[PDB]
């Protein structure tokens, strides 16, 4: 209530001075009144306690913020401390939200909460501060400072955007989708470490395109537009190349099916769906797995391999198992199951002969070590009342001599029941995080070297630390400069030609090829 | 039978004739260093001597085609603009 009272006092004072005194009468009066009231109340009334600035902002009082902005704007150095206190509150809220201590947090919920906080602050700014430049600069700086506190913040943003892009069950219409995408890209604007963001976005693209299609079929393109406008003409073009490769794959698959229908010799080739991808776009899963392929599928794949090694003579069709899916027709009705190219071999072995165990599926299968146990537990361990592969030794841990059985499980109310044990709650385990961190470290290692060999060929030479500033400025919007890494890597090229960059003779660099 | 497979959604990966046994630029291998590195250590001093993958699914040593970019600018086994879509095997 003090702000309203002082505003009324100022209004009555100026009215009295303009009506009861001389014509100008106001410059020293208003200056000294401001210097007495605001310059003394500014330090203590906004930070002490009992509904100051932080409390009147936490509860969401728009009128209080508006009147404070319209009052403190007259006195110099008022907006400075106002923005300082707002930034302090923002840092406190972010530290309370970006806290890493504690496992079991949903990345999509975390990104949603961060975006909600950003939208709330933007609404407060638009409603009270009248789009002041200083407040926008301060909030942008605060977001940049507090967001890069954790190294999994871009990963969580990628998970949130994947959750929003996989299906628009929330916000069926387009207006709210557009608004939330704009808010998400605005939040991404005040973020660093774009390399991990791009890597995880590409991984999410691979996950969403190599699974059941028809997710949005147009919102994916809206998102590519957004990323192109934000990140720049960089890797969004590589994702467009990936989409073109996918188009080639599908158009060639249906063409080859039509050619096989005209031949009428496709035996193992029934309702098939083979996708042809390029090594560069999609990274290898782990080590290109290998195992006994079921008879009918094997024949189909062998015919497709002949088709690719003959028309496109040279295409090395490498076999793999950590990708794709299948529809297993089981059989009182005929319910079709679903296998994600993991349980096909085990279930085929069961079809050939039942009453098997871990030894049987580890001896006559030649299957990788851990991805086998993952599928084995996805089939039996931790499964709700839809068990398609039961066992007698009911236990959490996996034993060796355990017999496997099958159950009816009439709980499925349709003929197309799928076992979606994969793509579970985001665990982001230590091994995968470490391996992707190493991969992105190598990505930065090539990103710096390619830049230094592309730019410095047409630039000047450095003596001690001249060109490093330029190479860090060119990568300022990409990631951290990492001075020790770049310093250790620039001195490794001296072993051979093409700008050896002689250390001892650091006076003239070889401007040759 | 009790379980029969109707549909399959396999994904086929393809690679061109990169000649894993002879680098198309240096003729050593698709790994195991290159002509200008030879010995494994050879005063490595960090840096890297891994494999470089292009947009055309061609693979050479990073050093080989990094030097070859000064001689020409179209991948020798074809006429395509060479990209750097991947680094390492
Ligand atoms: Zn070579
Ligand atoms: Zn080398
Ligand atoms: Zn090529």
Curated annotation (Swiss-Prot), chain A:
Core component of multiple cullin-RING-based BCR (BTB-CUL3-RBX1) E3 ubiquitin-protein ligase complexes which mediate the ubiquitination and subsequent proteasomal degradation of target proteins. BCR complexes and ARIH1 collaborate in tandem to mediate ubiquitination of target proteins. As a scaffold protein may contribute to catalysis through positioning of the substrate and the ubiquitin-conjugating enzyme. Belongs to the cullin family. Neddylated. Attachment of NEDD8 is required for the E3 ubiquitin-protein ligase activity of the BCR complex. Deneddylated via its interaction with the COP9 signalosome (CSN) complex. It comes from Homo sapiens (Human). Forms neddylation-dependent homodimers. Component of multiple BCR (BTB-CUL3-RBX1) E3 ubiquitin-protein ligase complexes formed of CUL3, RBX1 and a variable BTB domain-containing protein acting as both, adapter to cullin and substrate recognition subunit. The BCR complex may be active as a heterodimeric complex, in which NEDD8, covalently attached to one CUL3 molecule, binds to the C-terminus of a second CUL3 molecule. Interacts with RBX1, RNF7, CYCE and TIP120A/CAND1. Part of the BCR(SPOP) containing SPOP, and of BCR containing homodimeric SPOPL or the heterodimer formed by SPOP and SPOPL. Changing residue 54 to A: In NEDAUS; decreases interaction with KEAP1. Brain, spermatozoa, and testis (at protein level). Widely expressed. Residues 443-505 form the Cullin neddylation domain. This is Cullin-3. Residues 427-443 have a biased composition (Basic and acidic residues). It is found in: Nucleus; Golgi apparatus; Cell projection, Cilium, Flagellum; Cytoplasm, Cytoskeleton, Spindle. The keyword Transport applies. There is a cross-link at residue 457 (Glycyl lysine isopeptide (Lys-Gly) (interchain with G-Cter in NEDD8)). Residues 422-443 are annotated as: Disordered. One of its GO terms (molecular function) is POZ domain binding.
Curated annotation (Swiss-Prot), chain B:
It is found in: Cytoplasm; Nucleus. Widely expressed. It is an enzyme of class 2 (transferase). It catalyses: S-ubiquitinyl-[E2 ubiquitin-conjugating enzyme]-L-cysteine + [acceptor protein]-L-lysine = [E2 ubiquitin-conjugating enzyme]-L-cysteine + N(6)-ubiquitinyl-[acceptor protein]-L-lysine; S-[NEDD8-protein]-yl-[E2 NEDD8-conjugating enzyme]-L-cysteine + [cullin]-L-lysine = [E2 NEDD8-conjugating enzyme]-L-cysteine + N(6)-[NEDD8-protein]-yl-[cullin]-L-lysine. Zn(2+) 3 binds at residues 56, 58, 75, 78. Its EC number is 2.3.2.27, 2.3.2.32. Pathway: Protein modification; protein ubiquitination; Protein modification; protein neddylation. E3 ubiquitin ligase component of multiple cullin-RING-based E3 ubiquitin-protein ligase (CRLs) complexes which mediate the ubiquitination and subsequent proteasomal degradation of target proteins, including proteins involved in cell cycle progression, signal transduction, transcription and transcription-coupled nucleotide excision repair. CRLs complexes and ARIH1 collaborate in tandem to mediate ubiquitination of target proteins, ARIH1 mediating addition of the first ubiquitin on CRLs targets. This is E3 ubiquitin-protein ligase RBX1. It comes from Homo sapiens (Human).
